[PDB]
């Protein structure tokens, strides 16, 4: 957990893993000063709070640690911060809260909220690994943009220094996907976005691609492809895509695309290349 | 079926003061018709049988024909005489409690009316114990208290910081911000005007992104129009203004797609004025200076003569240089400079050490510290033509500028309304943006006085709050018109009270509201009395004297007497009057627990409270509204939160224990 | 015999933040030394055994030599980290109650100090439960509350109307009004400075009449000095300024007779500057225009060349006329006119009908609708010389003006202080006038904290009140340091409280006071908390945390709980703390009658009250202070006066009767 | 009581007759709108209030009208105004107050205060006759200036429309009388004032006279002479004074003087003139 963005990766995954449909995020000063992720999914009980931070004390708890995959990630984070937790489960209950050394009740909706203050308190170096506040937030905005595209069904609201930055609304059952796409990637891509939908049996290719004739260097930074919702970047897939732009028009310039490959679980398969190459080439013609 | 009334009337420079009375009923009324038309309409409406008028009444045409005319002397209409005499009858020292303190034109009319009645009756009239004004504006209401208390545009200390306006006013231009401020001080009742704005907010919600960038480019058009009427507008006023016109083609294009009749009407009122746009593009250089005195405003080609004069002046740059080089190389003196001075004019400067090596032709102009300056005939001839041409070029530039006003003022009428349209658009576009961004919903109106909120929140606090703001439901009607709010301090009484007032105003300006769903009836007047005793009692009376079934009333912990008993005794009798007689929609927050017996005995009353839970070394405010009353007094808990040492706290708890175990 | 203390330090752009601690005692302190000298003096004073400093600490010379030096990283001095961490120990969410909220420079130092102590101890330190700032000026301080509450220069709403300043500030010039405002925000403790002002007020009381008329003639000299430093002063600034110098001879004459060393010192600091006076009288015309651009500023004779250029220009008026007459009588054409135009220059105009009768020599210049304008060589030559001479005359006038700054700026030092002397005089003369006109007396000082008033009155209210203001005696000392004030509302509690605070400030600015006689001891801090609950408790704590024996405290009806018991329970424990531990001088106004048991049990406490008399359906307030407690609660009497209907009043009386006959 | 000045004459005499040492006076709008005289002398009891406004009603009162020569003046004034009275006696008591129709208690110092609202309240004409405002107050300022000079031992404070106008301090036991003289008559007279003190047996002449050589037409308006405190104006006394200016310097211009004659009461005497003539002539030489 070197950057703030890697700590955000972890806690944002934990919230979505609890079935969260609204993940509202408030940051200050590149994530150094304050970070707040709140999820309205399933919460944690009064028993599972205190021990998820703090080791022969496990003697009389009796395997509650098991229900806390996320509870593991906390321990690595909370030992090196002034972590301030608060949460409430769905069932008849009042919200609870831990500190610093003293746990006590609080008020919170059905879900979980976390607060992190100013890290490194004994390291001369790991602090001196600060970059910039503005640039750290640009990597947060990057990783949020990555995970935003991977999950269209979750409302993500992002703010920084009070100032609200982004507002991704959630997709309902089979909803209008255009409004989310333009909000994540701005005006430039949405106007030249050409849809692609390809399928031979188990292989399925869903997504969007910019028109090669009207693509600029600014548009070319948007290059993401997903394998069952997890973002991959392999050089054989890049080949299928760039060769397809090359053969339609002579201008072999950096393409702009957002693609989802959906297959059966294996580590990845030659038809994979041919399926992708023919998918994009058909849409351009 | 119609009234046998008495009336009194007078006029000053500004308008008319009017008063009416039924001596058989004890109903005593007042008004201040602003114009001659409303005055003529009010006379017809009331139908007085006898009329007292001032001998200085100018517009005799309003009254000549009316029955029961009585000419009165001037001294009877004295303002302070009226104040004293009315105070004597009601047994007061001031009239703030009657809600007519700020209406001296009416008060003078009542003062004269009073003196006549006493002399005609020559009997006491205890059946007349009060007075109320008949208010022209049926649309909109707010007393002094509410305007400041809610912090719409002004926090209570005096500034503009962290108000309602501060959160919602993310507009892009100053005139939109100003129009917003006027509409917030003016929520309208006509359901149809509100439906313009609701449809519009719904139709524009998608197009927020594309339009606001373009609106910013306008600048402060509204205040520039003031300076055009005065003949004082500046070149940089025109720079932005010109730039504003260049966006109107683009704005006309984007607005055409918005499906809304209010929008299409505004898009036409907007215009582009392609003719006046072209004029400024040709007549002025692309980036002008602040003042007219400096010149460099008018672009060349537009005027042939301006170019000519500039040619004489622009024949400078090339001419001066040729002389400098020729003279420097001729003499062999390298410190030879051709420079300019405002007092002495152009010159050829030579340093002190080289001064004695100068040519004979050089006539000395100016002696200095480190140098001697000279003049020659060639330079002196050219000096005169340049200064005179510059003078004439600059004088013509000032003349052409003034003549531009003459040709533009003919369109002044259409342009003022173009600016009013643009201000309205910035307001409404900002509103469509805030409704989407801050998660609001579309409300509906109803017949009877009543409010039903689903998941209502406080619009400013919920965003500025760095914790979960707990949304709360509200269910009110004519059958549920009064709520007894018990609970702890910092429980969220005033917040849940004030969020209701803010929510209501948003609905009556046509905006979407922070809730899942909202229904709301007609409301005639909004009243407020929040803790800062003279202060308290006079304002409570005012609310009592003027409220009706439609009235919204927000009481924040009143009923403090000069002891414990008397204050509560009042609060009990007060709520009775409001619930039983007036039947107004009321929220009554308080700390006196004994009031919680009322819901059993008074119909249309129920107990609610802000719930809190005590345990361990602390307390947790759920901030949720519940049916029922508070568990206890939480004063000892609240004092520790403010910052009090434990010495005092521990003594208080021990002492409280003694007092509670007396009985 | 030396204390073994810990300290922390750092610096930003503005100054230095400092903190000190004794871990054996639990005493935790803060400060903000403003400059290098005070900083070096504070280090010597405290004598720390170990010192934490920031790695960006620039002026290392202050700390290099001190013992126990520890270099700290920057991140430890974070302001909001300090806020959160301090809040965690004390169990608060904010630090308003500790009275260090607006001292972030100090707070950052404590935040770093805090983290070190925890690491060294590795034990809880509940013996440290608080913090207080060491405030530099031992000459006095007022909190936020008192400044607004008393309405010194600002009434509570926000304006300047009917304040203390409004009644006392009948000064004649703006800079005196402004100096007055600074001195009211700054009452001084040094006995000697107050005695300057007392002798002065006594010595000048006769001469009020002769001096204020002369002071009015000065104008706003102080703000003109700002614009002289910026090189932007205007001609009418100099007009008043010159007129001000002409009064200094007269003022020096009248002040010589005043027997007072402070007065004679000021009369010297004043001066007359006879040399600079003569300069302006000769250099500028008696009545100048607003700006420099117009010209007509510099008077003739002062400059030989300016006169020369004006002769060419002033050769206009007589020359133009001679040509007009000659040409009109020569041709026999009566419509022949000589006029001027800015664009085309001078011309000879002839009407359309006569145009064909013009001479051969006339060259046509400008053609118009109803006339033709011509030009001749004689007029065209003269045209160029006039415009160029005007330009040079005006350009010389602008140069001479800029050169006047160069010659005056060398006296700038003595002139700034001359202006400071004159501002002080307007303040003091006004004060000598108010003391005489409003019937004030000379007070005396004492050793120990105490106040003894004979016939004390409220200085603003007594004059604005349209009735007799009842003066009241006051007797306070270390043996009588707390008064329990019971009584009715509008009895005069807050008035008799606030008159005491206003009276005290007048004494500590050196002024005479509205009383027959006054004695007063030293006062270190003045504290206030008046009703507008979170609001109330935090502020009371601050007064508790920071008070001493010398402190003035004015409580106005605090101790409102979340019910009846809890609020009183606090008020009791509060007064105990003040009376027993702090021994401060206190006035405790309230409505809870049970407090009146304290004088029996607590030494230095006695009962007083505002007396009132009840009869029929009204009440008479004597407004006189009496020993003992109130008769009853008078809330029922007060409510009628506000304007409440009898339905409510009758219910309250019936109900009160039940409650009073329980017990 | 035609003018406001004559109503002031009456109530001001009544206050001084009660041993008043401070008479504070507040007026508004030429005396039409408001007039307030407060005296701090002896007051009136709760018994002597009600019947002093409202005459076979004396039937059950038992001769209290005797203590009320002032009580008679009230009746003439109060019948034709909205008179508002308030007063309190010297011994332990509460102040009392009458109106309009309702009498009740109040709070007031040891003394008496009176309030009058545009005296005439039933006459349409007699109010409408009442002349200007500024000019009425100038006759008030005149009559105050007359009575101010007659009593140096009484503090008189005068105000009008909020604006405080004049402030005559009372002379203590054998005090500095210069401060009062300058305040009444301005700086002009005080600078040229020559003192006069003459006495043959019963006749006593006290006062001040301006130096004839430096007297202007503005100073010449100050021409007052008193006979045992009461201001008289007879032609014989004017003769003595003006003949004295004539014989010293040839300039026979209007003199400026303030003189007090003190004798035994008899209704009228040639030595009167010679005593006065020789008194002033001696001081000039
Ligand atoms: N010494 C006095 N002489 C004449 N009138 C007075 C005097 N003291 C007070 N009053 C009047 O009494 C009123 C009450 O003053 P105040 O002390 O504010 O009452 P309180 O008991 O503090 N209640 P509140 O005004 O509600 O805060 C004021 O309006 C004054 O006009
Ligand atoms: N619905 C809500 N959700 C979240 N926080 C709330 C809510 N209502 C109130 N609060 C917070 O709780 C505090 C208490 O509210 P408030 O209504 O001011 O108490 P109160 O009864 O007015 N006490 P006082 O100010 O002494 O009269 C406020 O400062 C809010 O920040």
Sign of the four-CA dihedral C299, C302, C306, C310: positive
Sign of the four-CA dihedral C114, C117, C121, C127: negative
User: DSSP secondary-structure letter at B513?
Assistant: B
Nearest to C128 by CA among C225, C221, C43, C19: C19
- Angle of helix B316-331 versus helix B304-314 axis, rounded to 10: 10
User: DSSP secondary-structure letter at D276?
Assistant: H
Sign of the four-CA dihedral A121, A123, A128, A132: negative
Dihedral through CA D222, CA D226, CA D231, CA D232, nearest 10? -100
Cα B275 to Cα C107: distance, rounded to the nearest angstrom: 63
Of B395, B489, B570, the CB nearest to C639: B570
Per CATH, the number for C5-136 is: 3.30.420.110
> Whose atoms come closest to the Cα of C466: which ligand?
1
State the burial class of residue D149 (Cβ atoms within 10 Å of its Cβ: 0-12, 13-18, 19+). buried
> Whose atoms come closest to the Cα of C470: which ligand?
1
Residue whose structure tokens are 């005055």:
B39
Cβ atoms of residues D80 and D120 within 8 Å? yes
In this structure, the strands spanning C371-375 and C345-351 are antiparallel
Residue whose structure tokens are 């203004």:
B241
Nearest to C144 by CA among C583, C415, C414, C529: C529
- Ligand 2, atom 7: nearest CA belongs to which residue? B492
Query: Domains plus CATH for chain A?
Result: 4-168 (3.30.565.10), 187-284 (3.30.230.10)
Q: Which residues in chain A touch residue C73, judged by CB atoms under 8 angstroms apart?
A: 124, 127
Q: Which fold has domain B444-632?
A: Rossmann fold (3.40.50)
C506 is in an annotated binding site: no
Cα D176 to Cα D171: distance, rounded to the nearest angstrom: 7
> Whose atoms come closest to the Cα of C589: which ligand?
1
- Angle of helix B261-270 versus helix B235-255 axis, rounded to 10: 150
- Residue D102: closest C-alpha in chain B: B88
In this structure, the strands spanning C585-589 and C482-486 are parallel
Q: Please name the residues in contact with A4: beta carbons below 8 A apart, sequence gap of 6 or more.
A: A30, A31, A32, A35, A136, A140
User: DSSP secondary-structure letter at C299?
Assistant: P
C88:A99 CB<8 A? yes
Sign of the four-CA dihedral C587, C588, C593, C598: negative
Query: Domain spans of chain B?
Result: 5-133, 158-285+411-437, 305-406, 444-632
Nearest to B519 by CA among B450, B565, B437, B436: B450
In this structure, the strands spanning C451-456 and C517-520 are antiparallel
Cβ atoms of residues B597 and B571 within 8 Å? no
User: Where is C8: in which H helix or E strand?
Assistant: strand C5-11
Q: Does A94 touch chain B (CB under 8 A)?
A: yes
User: Where is C461: in which H helix or E strand?
Assistant: helix C461-464
Instruction: Kindly list the distances between the CA atom of residue C143 and the CA atoms of B566, B618, C350, C648, D264, in Å, as whole numbers in the listed order.
Output: 35, 31, 80, 42, 69
SS (H, E, C) C423-442: HHHHHHHHHHHHHHHCCCEC
User: DSSP secondary-structure letter at B442?
Assistant: -
Q: Please name the residues in contact with B10: beta carbons below 8 A apart, sequence gap of 6 or more.
A: B16, B17, B53, B54, B56, B57, B77, B105, B108, B109, B112
| Cα C33 from chain centroid (whole Å) | 24
Q: State both tokens at D264.
A: 């035994």
Q: State both tokens at C31.
A: 């400060």
Nearest to B456 by CA among B414, B492, B430: B492
How far does the centroid of ligand 1 lie from the alpha carbon of residue B149, in Å? 25
Cβ atoms of residues C302 and C282 within 8 Å? yes
Question: What is the b/e burial string over C53-65, where b = at least 16 CB atoms within 10 angstroms of the residue's CB?
Answer: bbeeeeeeebeee
Cβ atoms of residues A23 and A39 within 8 Å? yes
The DSSP bridge partners found for residue B372 are B350, B367
Cα D196 to Cα D177: distance, rounded to the nearest angstrom: 14
Sign of the four-CA dihedral B163, B167, B169, B174: positive
Cα C166 to Cα C149: distance, rounded to the nearest angstrom: 15
Cα C562 to Cα B487: distance, rounded to the nearest angstrom: 8
Cβ atoms of residues C453 and C521 within 8 Å? no
Nearest to A88 by CA among B624, C36, C337: B624
B613:A105 CB<8 A? yes
Q: Please name the residues in contact with D285: beta carbons below 8 A apart, sequence gap of 6 or more.
A: D248
Cα B439 to Cα B480: distance, rounded to the nearest angstrom: 29
Cα B42 to Cα B48: distance, rounded to the nearest angstrom: 10
Nearest to A211 by CA among A196, A197, A193: A193
The DSSP bridge partners found for residue D13 are none
A104:B616 CB<8 A? yes
Q: State both tokens at B449.
A: 């006085």
Q: Would the CATH topology of B158-285+411-437 be identical to that of B305-406? A: yes
Nearest to B301 by CA among B278, B321, B285: B285
SS (H, E, C) B605-623: EEEEEEEEEEECCEEEEEE
Cα C534 to Cα D44: distance, rounded to the nearest angstrom: 53
Cα B143 to Cα B511: distance, rounded to the nearest angstrom: 22
Q: ∠ CA B6-B11-B12 to the nearest 5 degrees?
A: 150
Q: Which residues in chain B touch residue D83, judged by CB atoms under 8 angstroms apart?
A: none
The DSSP bridge partners found for residue D96 are D87, D105
User: DSSP secondary-structure letter at C298?
Assistant: B
Cα B621 to Cα B616: distance, rounded to the nearest angstrom: 14
Q: ∠ CA B196-B198-B202 to the nearest 5 degrees?
A: 120
Nearest to B213 by CA among B421, B440, B433: B433
How far does the centroid of ligand 2 lie from the alpha carbon of residue B499, in Å? 11
Cα D258 to Cα D189: distance, rounded to the nearest angstrom: 10
Nearest to C445 by CA among C261, C198, C205: C198
User: DSSP secondary-structure letter at B299?
Assistant: P
- For ligand 1, residues with CB inside 6 Å are B 533-534; C 469-470, 472, 489-496, 623
Q: State both tokens at C481.
A: 């340091």
In this structure, the strands spanning C141-142 and C585-589 are unpaired
Cβ under 8 Å to B: A residues 34-93: 36, 38
Cα C171 to Cα C427: distance, rounded to the nearest angstrom: 7
Atom number of ligand 1 nearest to Cα B536: 26
Cβ atoms of residues C494 and C505 within 8 Å? no
Q: Please name the residues in contact with B323: beta carbons below 8 A apart, sequence gap of 6 or more.
A: B338, B378, B379
Cβ atoms of residues D153 and D171 within 8 Å? yes
> Whose atoms come closest to the Cα of B538: which ligand?
1
How far does the centroid of ligand 1 lie from the alpha carbon of residue C461, in Å? 10
- Strand runs (DSSP E) across chain D, as ranges? 22-28, 34-39, 84-88, 95-98, 104-106, 111-117, 155-160, 163-168, 193-200, 203-210, 223-227, 230-232, 257-262
User: Where is B353: in which H helix or E strand?
Assistant: none
| DSSP per-residue string spanning C483-549 | EEEE--TTSSHHHHHHHHHHHHHHHTTT--BSSSEEEE----EEEEEE---HHHHHHHHHHHHH--T
Cα D144 to Cα D16: distance, rounded to the nearest angstrom: 13
How far does the centroid of ligand 2 lie from the alpha carbon of residue B485, in Å? 13
State the burial class of residue C91 (Cβ atoms within 10 Å of its Cβ: 0-12, 13-18, 19+). middle
Cα C521 to Cα C504: distance, rounded to the nearest angstrom: 10
D99:B88 CB<8 A? yes
Neighbours of chain C (3+ CB pairs under 8 A): A, B, D
Q: Please name the residues in contact with C375: beta carbons below 8 A apart, sequence gap of 6 or more.
A: C345, C346, C347, C348, C362, C363, C364, C365
Nearest to C608 by CA among C594, C592, C583, C588: C588
Q: Which fold has domain B5-133?
A: Nucleotidyltransferase; domain 5 (3.30.420)
Q: How many CB atoms lie within 10 A of CB B434?
A: 21
User: DSSP secondary-structure letter at C41?
Assistant: H
The DSSP bridge partners found for residue D104 are D97
Architecture (CATH level 2) of domain B158-285+411-437: Orthogonal Bundle (1.10)
Nearest to B551 by CA among B147, B141, B148, B146: B141
d(CA C106, nearest CA chain A) in Å:
20
- Angle of helix D178-192 versus helix D134-150 axis, rounded to 10: 100
Alpha helices in C122-169 (DSSP H): 144-149, 164-168
In this structure, the strands spanning A163-168 and A155-160 are antiparallel
- Chains B and A touch each other (3 or more Cβ pairs < 8 A): yes
CB pairs under 8 A between B and D: 13
| Cα C643 from chain centroid (whole Å) | 39
Q: Which residues in chain A touch residue C84, judged by CB atoms under 8 angstroms apart?
A: 82, 117
Report the phi/psi class of residue B85: left, alpha or beta, with left for phi > 0 and alpha for psi in -120 to 50: alpha
In this structure, the strands spanning A111-117 and A84-88 are antiparallel
Helix, strand, coil shares, percent, chain A, to 5: 40, 25, 35
B441 SS3 class = strand
Of C562, C640, C655, the CB nearest to B569: C655
Atom number of ligand 2 nearest to Cα B470: 3
- Ligand 1, atom 10: nearest CA belongs to which residue? C492
| Interface probe, candidates B154, B346, B562, chain C, greatest C C-beta count within 10 A | B562
How far does the centroid of ligand 2 lie from the alpha carbon of residue A127, in Å? 39
Annotated binding site of B for ATP: 487-494
How far does the centroid of ligand 1 lie from the alpha carbon of residue C167, in Å? 19
Q: State both tokens at B182.
A: 């006027």
C99 is in an annotated binding site: no
Cα D171 to Cα D189: distance, rounded to the nearest angstrom: 19
User: DSSP secondary-structure letter at C284?
Assistant: B
Q: Looking at the domain covering C146-272+414-437, what would its CATH class be?
A: mainly alpha
User: DSSP secondary-structure letter at C331?
Assistant: H
Largest CA distance in chain A: 71
Nearest to C459 by CA among C164, C202, C177, C181: C164
Q: Please name the residues in contact with C612: beta carbons below 8 A apart, sequence gap of 6 or more.
A: C487, C488, C491, C619, C620, C621, C622, C630, C631, C634
State phi, psi for B40 to the nearest 5 degrees: -60, -35
C304-406 CATH choice from 3.20.20.70, 1.10.1420.10, 3.30.1650.10, 1.10.490.10: 1.10.1420.10
The DSSP bridge partners found for residue A156 are A23, A168
Nearest to C207 by CA among C156, C273, C257: C257
Cα C385 to Cα C117: distance, rounded to the nearest angstrom: 86
The DSSP bridge partners found for residue B587 are B483, B554
Beta-sheet strand order (sheet of B16-22): B69-72, B48-54, B5-11, B16-22, B27-31, B132-133
Cα C579 to Cα C629: distance, rounded to the nearest angstrom: 19
Nearest to B366 by CA among B382, B346, B381: B346
State the burial class of residue B656 (Cβ atoms within 10 Å of its Cβ: 0-12, 13-18, 19+). buried
- For ligand 2, residues with CB inside 6 Å are B 469-470, 472, 489-496, 623; C 533-534
Per CATH, the number for B305-406 is: 1.10.1420.10
Cα B601 to Cα C242: distance, rounded to the nearest angstrom: 82
Question: What is the b/e burial string over C106-128, where b = at least 16 CB atoms within 10 angstroms of the residue's CB?
Answer: bbbbbbbbbbbbeeeeeeeeeeb
Cα C193 to Cα C508: distance, rounded to the nearest angstrom: 10
How far does the centroid of ligand 1 lie from the alpha carbon of residue C631, in Å? 17
C620:D187 CB<8 A? no
Q: Does D109 touch chain C (CB under 8 A)?
A: yes
Q: How many CB atoms lie within 10 A of CB B45?
A: 9
Q: How many CB atoms lie within 10 A of CB B261?
A: 11
State the burial class of residue A234 (Cβ atoms within 10 Å of its Cβ: 0-12, 13-18, 19+). exposed
Cβ atoms of residues C549 and C449 within 8 Å? yes
Q: How was this structure determined?
A: X-ray
Report the phi/psi class of residue D174: left, alpha or beta, with left for phi > 0 and alpha for psi in -120 to 50: left
Residue whose structure tokens are 């290099």:
C64
Q: Which residues in chain C touch residue D93, judged by CB atoms under 8 angstroms apart?
A: none
């Amino acid at each position: 957990v070197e950057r703030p963005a890697s700590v955000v990766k972890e806690l944002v995954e934990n919230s979505l893993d609890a079935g969260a449909t609204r993940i509202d995020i408030d940051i200050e000063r590149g994530g150094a000063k304050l970070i707040r992720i709140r999820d309205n999914g399933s919460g944690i009980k009064k028993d599972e709070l205190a021990l998820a931070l703090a080791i022969a004390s496990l003697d009389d708890l009796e395997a509650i640690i098991s229900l806390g995959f996320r509870g593991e990630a906390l321990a690595s984070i909370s030992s090196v911060s002034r972590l301030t937790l608060t949460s409430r489960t769905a069932e008849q209950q009042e919200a609870w809260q831990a500190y610093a050394v003293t746990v006590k009740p609080a008020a919170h909706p059905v879900g979980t909220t976390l607060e992190v203050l100013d890290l490194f308190y004994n390291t001369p170096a790991r602090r001196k690994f600060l970059r910039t506040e503005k640039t750290e937030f640009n990597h947060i905005d990057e990783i949020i943009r990555r995970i935003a595209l991977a999950r269209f069904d979750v409302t993500i609201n992002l703010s920084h220094n009070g100032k609200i930055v982004r507002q991704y609304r959630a997709v309902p059952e089979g909803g209008q996907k255009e409004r989310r796409l333009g909000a994540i990637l701005g005006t430039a891509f949405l106007e030249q976005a050409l849809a692609i939908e390809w399928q031979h049996g188990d292989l399925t290719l869903r997504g969007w691609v910019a028109d090669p004739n009207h693509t600029t260097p600014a548009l070319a930074e948007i290059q993401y492809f997903y394998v069952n919702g997890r973002m991959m970047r392999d050089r054989l897939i890049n080949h299928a895509i760039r060769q397809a732009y090359e053969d339609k028009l002579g201008a072999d310039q950096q393409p702009a695309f957002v693609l989802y490959l959906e297959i059966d679980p294996h580590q990845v398969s030659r038809l994979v290349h041919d399926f992708i190459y023919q998918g994009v080439l058909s849409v351009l013609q | 079926r119609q009234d046998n009334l008495l009336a009194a009337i007078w006029q000053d420079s500004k308008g008319f003061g009017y008063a009416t009375l039924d001596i058989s009923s004890g109903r005593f009324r007042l008004s201040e018709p602003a114009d001659r038309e409303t005055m003529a309409a009010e006379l017809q409406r009331t139908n007085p049988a006898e009329l007292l008028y001032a001998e200085d009444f100018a517009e005799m045409s309003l009254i000549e024909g009316r029955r029961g005319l009585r000419r009165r002397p001037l001294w009877e209409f004295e303002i302070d005489t009226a104040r004293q005499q009315l105070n004597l009858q009601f047994g007061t020292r001031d009239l703030v409690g009657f809600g007519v303190e700020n209406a001296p034109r009416g008060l003078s009319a009542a003062g004269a009316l009073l003196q006549y009645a006493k002399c005609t009756q020559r009997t006491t009239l205890p059946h007349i114990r009060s007075i109320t004004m008949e208010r022209e504006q049926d649309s909109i209401i707010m007393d002094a208290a509410t305007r400041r208390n809610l912090e719409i545009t002004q926090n209570l200390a005096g500034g503009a910081e962290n108000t309602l306006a501060s959160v919602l006013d993310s507009t892009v231009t100053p005139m939109g911000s100003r129009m917003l401020k006027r509409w917030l001080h003016m929520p309208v009742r006509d359901t149809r005007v509100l439906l313009e704005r609701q449809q519009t907010i719904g139709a524009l919600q998608d197009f927020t992104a594309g339009l606001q960038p373009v609106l910013r480019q306008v600048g402060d058009l509204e205040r520039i129009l003031a300076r055009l009427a005065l003949r004082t507008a500046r070149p940089r006023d025109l720079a932005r203004m010109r730039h504003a016109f260049q966006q109107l083609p683009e704005l006309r294009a984007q607005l055409e797609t918005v499906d809304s009749a209010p929008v299409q009407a505004l898009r036409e009122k907007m215009g582009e004025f392609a003719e006046l746009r072209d004029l400024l593009e040709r007549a002025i250089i692309d980036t002008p200076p602040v003042l007219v005195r400096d010149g460099g405003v008018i672009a060349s080609g537009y005027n042939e003569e301006l170019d000519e004069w500039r040619a004489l002046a622009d024949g400078a740059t090339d001419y001066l240089e040729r002389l400098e080089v020729r003279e420097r190389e001729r003499t062999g003196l390298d410190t030879l400079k051709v420079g300019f001075n405002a007092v002495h004019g152009y010159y050829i400067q030579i340093s002190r050490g080289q001064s004695h090596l100068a040519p004979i032709n050089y006539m000395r102009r100016q002696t200095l510290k480190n140098a001697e300056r000279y003049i020659i005939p060639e330079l002196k001839e050219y000096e005169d033509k340049v200064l005179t041409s510059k003078g004439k070029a600059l004088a013509l530039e000032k003349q052409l500028y003034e003549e531009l006003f003459d040709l533009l003022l003919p369109h002044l009428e259409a342009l003022q309304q173009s600016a009013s349209a643009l201000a309205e658009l910035d307001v409404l576009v900002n509103l469509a943006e805030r409704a989407y961004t801050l998660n609001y919903t579309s409300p509906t109106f109803i017949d009877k006085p009543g409010i039903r909120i689903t998941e209502g929140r406080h619009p400013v606090v919920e965003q500025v709050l760095n914790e979960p703001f707990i949304a709360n439901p509200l269910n009110l009607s004519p059958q549920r018109r009064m709520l007894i709010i018990t609970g702890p301090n910092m429980g969220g009484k005033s917040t849940y009270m004030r969020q209701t007032a803010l929510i209501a105003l948003m609905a009556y300006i046509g905006s979407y509201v922070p809730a899942q769903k909202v229904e709301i009836g007609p409301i005639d007047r909004i009243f407020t009395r929040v803790g800062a005793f003279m202060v308290e009692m006079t304002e409570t009376a005012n609310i009592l004297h003027n409220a009706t079934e439609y009235s919204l009333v927000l009481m924040d912990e009143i009923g403090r007497g000069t002891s414990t008993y008397d204050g509560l005794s009042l609060a009990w009798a007060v709520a009775e009057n409001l619930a039983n007689k007036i039947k107004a929609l009321t929220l009554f927050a308080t700390h006196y627990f004994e009031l919680t017996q009322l819901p059993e005995k008074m119909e249309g009353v129920a107990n609610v409270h802000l719930d809190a839970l005590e345990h361990g070394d602390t307390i947790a405010f759920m901030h949720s509204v519940q049916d029922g009353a508070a568990s206890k007094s939480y004063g000892l808990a609240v004092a520790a939160l403010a910052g009090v040492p434990k010495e005092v706290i521990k003594r208080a708890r021990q002492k409280l224990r003694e007092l509670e175990s007396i009985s």
